[PDB]
Structure 1
Amino acid sequence: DVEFDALLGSYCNTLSLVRFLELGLSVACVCTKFPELAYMNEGRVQFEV
């Protein structure tokens, strides 16, 4: 009498990653990198209306 325990497979998933600009939400944001942002103190925007 012979006996064996069989390991018959496994399946990983691809952890898919989205872009955030490959997405319809990103019309509402103007995302611009300001890479000195820590060194900023206070900023204003002008509006002549």
Structure 2
Amino acid sequence: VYTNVVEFVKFLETALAAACVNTEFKDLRRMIDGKIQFKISMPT
């Protein structure tokens, strides 16, 4: 009997992950929203 096994992949061991900050969040089904409030001051 001759079988194949497909090559498995990891997300964090690909060079795609320079474009993402990666924080594992344990219970995301308990979240409604999230927000980031920027406050840009401006010189004149």
Alignment TM class, shorter chain as reference: 0.5 to 0.7
Aligned length: 40
Max radius of gyration: which structure?
A: 1
Q: What does 1:31-42 correspond to in 2, within 5 Å?
A: 31-42=22-33
Stretches of 4+ aligned residues off by more than 4 angstroms: none
Aligned to 2:21: 30
Q: CA RMSD in A?
A: 1.6
Aligned to 1:6: none
Does 2:21 align with 1:12? no
TM-score, normalization by structure 1: 0.58
Q: Secondary structure at the match of 2:34?
A: coil
Greater RCO, 1 or 2 (C-alpha within 8 Å, sep 6+): 2
CA distance in 2 between counterparts of 1:20 and 1:40 reads 24
Unaligned runs of 5+ in 2: none
Unaligned runs of 5+ in 1: 1-9
